[PDB]
A paper describes a structure:
One candidate cyclic GMP effector is XC_0249, a protein with a predicted cyclic mononucleotide-binding (cNMP) domain attached to a GGDEF domain that is active in synthesis of cyclic di-GMP. Our data suggest that the action of cyclic GMP in Xcc depends in part on XC_0249, which has a cyclic GMP-binding domain attached to a GGDEF domain active in cyclic di-GMP synthesis. The findings showed that cyclic GMP addition led to an increase in the activity of XC_0249 in cyclic di-GMP synthesis. Mutation of either XC_0250 or XC_0249 led to a reduced virulence to plants and reduced biofilm formation in vitro.
To further characterise the binding of cyclic GMP by the cNMP domain of XC_0249, we determined the crystal structure of the domain with the nucleotide bound to a resolution of 2.2 Å. The XC_0249 cyclic NMP-binding domain crystallises as a dimer. The Fo-Fc electron density map of the complex showed a clear electron density for cyclic GMP adopting a syn configuration when bound to the protein, that is with the ribose H1’ and guanine H8 bonds oriented in the same direction. Cyclic GMP makes a number of contacts with the residues surrounding the ligand-binding pocket. A number of these residues form specific H bonds with the ribose 2′-OH, phosphate lactone oxygen atoms and, importantly, with the guanine base. Residue E146 is especially interesting, as it is located within the opposing αC helix, with its two carboxylate oxygen atoms forming two crucial H bonds with the guanine N1 and N2 atoms. The major difference between the two structures is the diad motif of N145 and E146, which form strong H bonds with the guanine base of cyclic GMP and which contribute to cyclic GMP binding.
Residue numbers in the entry:
A (entry chain B): 25 to 147
B (entry chain A): 23 to 147
The structure:
Amino acid sequence: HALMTAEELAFFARFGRMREIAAGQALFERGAVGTQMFIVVTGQIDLDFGEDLMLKHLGPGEFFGELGLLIGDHARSAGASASVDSRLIELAHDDFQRLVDHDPSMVAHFLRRSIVRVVNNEQ
Amino acid sequence: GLHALMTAEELAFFARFGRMREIAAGQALFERGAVGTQMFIVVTGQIDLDFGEDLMLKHLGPGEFFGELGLLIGDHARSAGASASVDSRLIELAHDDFQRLVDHDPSMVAHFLRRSIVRVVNNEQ
Ligand SMILES: Nc1nc2c(ncn2[C@@H]2O[C@@H]3COP(=O)(O)O[C@H]3[C@H]2O)c(=O)[nH]1
Ligand SMILES: Nc1nc2c(ncn2[C@@H]2O[C@@H]3COP(=O)(O)O[C@H]3[C@H]2O)c(=O)[nH]1
């Protein structure tokens, strides 16, 4: 599972912003354009990779959408939706660029863990 | 496009933190499925990647990099065999070298890691 560090949670939250999403609501659809990533801080997000694949359940501290964030014109690999009332850190393209500028070391450590996760990965 | 290519800054800094390696035409650098914790940058010649099955070979010329998965992911097994098509020269960057690089220039590394992710999401033959 994902899981940010405490330092990441605090900083991504400050550079990004919070987003509330109700039980049953869609955050984005599979195959859609999307340039922001998200961190679950309360509740649960379900990822739907289409076809007959297992759903992934993401609880507090887990992140997703970094591909949309990091790769231009990426199409969302899964649909994202809220299982229950949830709250998220939403981090946009510009926010991430700011973060890299202010704290490249922390970002490098994050990107590194991302790569490990993403080569793991793909149902 | 979708070919690697380091920046000039990367080439110089990866060269300095790492070391150089000569490899003769026909020689294997590593086998597919093996343990491997270093990455490589081609600076002369050409490295061929063999992904097994019936997949196309990939040909990497000067300035192209490979093996970063082995470098970044513990207990990764090499996704391809690597071998020299012609006499080649490489920058070899070891695990410890990369950690030194991160510590001295995190910003350069972050930019590199970012470019890696794009390449890798656009990979797998
Ligand atoms: N493609 C893929 N994406 C995954 C997987 N597990 C989690 N994800 C995340 O699901 C996300 C959906 O949005 P993106 O396409 O932006 O980024 C994706 C990944 O960050 C997986 O196994 N495969
Ligand atoms: N998995 C994968 N690796 C690739 C591809 N093209 C180039 N590579 C590189 O091939 C390398 C084989 O060694 P590694 O797995 O160390 O690291 C890998 C990458 O740097 C591709 O299409 N798929």
